[PDB]
Amino acid sequence: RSSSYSGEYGSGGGKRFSHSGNQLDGPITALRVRVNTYYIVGLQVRYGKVWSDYVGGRNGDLEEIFLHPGESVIQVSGKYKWYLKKLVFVTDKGRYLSFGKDSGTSFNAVPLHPNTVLRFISGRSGSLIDAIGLHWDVYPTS
């Protein structure tokens, strides 16, 4: 009853992906974002102890952030122009995790219902991240 969805932010190219099935592996516990000179290139998210299937390209440097136990994302903002250019993940331990460059159209995603967190992502990808959507729900008890 508490789930919500923000998106889809970006353009309509590439191939759809969704981490809806990965929810069963656990809460989000880590993020990988690949970034090149121009764009957000790729994404991988750890659900419990299991990484999602990587989406995006091979170009660029990877950044890997491990969330603390019980830390979740409660806001995702960013920018896109043709493809995703910037992503900012804000956590409920007060951390701001920023990736990419400030150029393009801005978006800001927050959960519709209070006391919910980022449970999974979806979007579109190819050699880059074309679009992103954020799926919010209660933090998992089991």
Residue numbers in the entry: 22 to 163
Wording from the paper:
Zymogen granule membrane protein 16 (ZG16) is produced in organs that secrete large quantities of enzymes and other proteins into the digestive tract. ZG16 binds microbial pathogens, and lower ZG16 expression levels correlate with colorectal cancer, but the physiological function of the protein is poorly understood. One prominent attribute of ZG16 is its ability to bind glycans, but other aspects of the protein may also contribute to activity. An intriguing feature of ZG16 is a CXXC motif at the carboxy terminus.
Here, we describe crystal structures and biochemical studies showing that the CXXC motif is on a flexible tail, where it contributes little to structure or stability but is available to engage in redox reactions. ZG16 crystal structures also draw attention to a nonproline cis peptide bond that can isomerize within the protein and to the mobility of glycine‐rich loops in the glycan‐binding site. An understanding of the properties of the ZG16 CXXC motif and the discovery of internal conformational switches extend existing knowledge relating to the glycan‐binding activity of the protein.
